[PDB]
Write a protein that binds this ligand. Sequence first.
Ligand code: I0A
Length: 289
Amino acid sequence: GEAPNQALLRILKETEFKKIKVLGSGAFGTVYKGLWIPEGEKVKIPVAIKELSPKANKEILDEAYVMASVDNPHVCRLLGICLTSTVQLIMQLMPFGSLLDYVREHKDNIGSQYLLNWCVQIAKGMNYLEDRRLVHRDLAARNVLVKTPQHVKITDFGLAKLLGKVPIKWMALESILHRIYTHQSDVWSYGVTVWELMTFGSKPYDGIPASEISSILEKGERLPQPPICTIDVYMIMVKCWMIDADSRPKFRELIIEFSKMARDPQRYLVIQGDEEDMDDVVDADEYLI
Ligand SMILES: CCS(=O)(=O)n1cc2c3ccc(cc31)OCCCCCCOc1cc(ccc1N1CCOCC1)Nc1ncc(Cl)c-2n1
């Protein structure tokens, strides 16, 4: 029971945008890179169009509701939806793809400053979501997209729910065992995501069946310390992975700590060699109504 959600849901004409290329596909559906041109407004906006039964429409509209209810520089911006045969979701295009893929591809040219700034931005997005009493439930490096190497945004709100099949290796223990989800379980997943970033995109618990992850965590086992990580960063992750959810750090505290770290990045991360016509193109972050 909260304030009325006065967010605007925008309906976009299908004739207004052109699909350009396929970005990805799978059981969830397919996502296209494309361009959106509102009629007579003299702007072209690079967009991602998510697409794929009446059960699919229900969940896609739940995602549209969630994403239309949020507005943060570190959260995916939903431009609107196009009511075709299957409902399409129009989102801001993130040219550089997922943070996981970007990090795996560019690990040889990624420094401490970028990693700590990404941690700061992700924490800011999650803190904003907490302010909106929103629980993401699927936070991971694969669900963080790169608008620019200096700017990342949280996406994939398919599992997002209000405060009141799952990827086991990113979940808190209480979520694995009692299906309890809280902003602190999101903090656990944030720790796992930071681990993904610091190991340059390695698979957490590589080769371990998901069925024994619960026992592994119950025994006290945790993800190892990444080589580039000083005890400060790894301690932050371990705090995010504590059993008592109230003992885990809050997202605002993570913002503070990682900002402190980013002011002197080399003290906290040790990385070898650290030191056609688009005239009218407008990014969605600069197209407001
Ligand atoms: C994150 C789950 S998602 O369902 O919410 N989702 C959101 C997407 C998106 C794209 C493809 C996709 C799922 C997507 O298919 C399965 C995922 C496989 C590829 C992951 C990232 O791929 C890219 C994305 C984007 C640009 C390039 C890639 N890559 C680059 C090269 O390597 C292959 C493709 N720019 C984007 N901009 C807004 C949204 Cl909103 C999106 N992507």
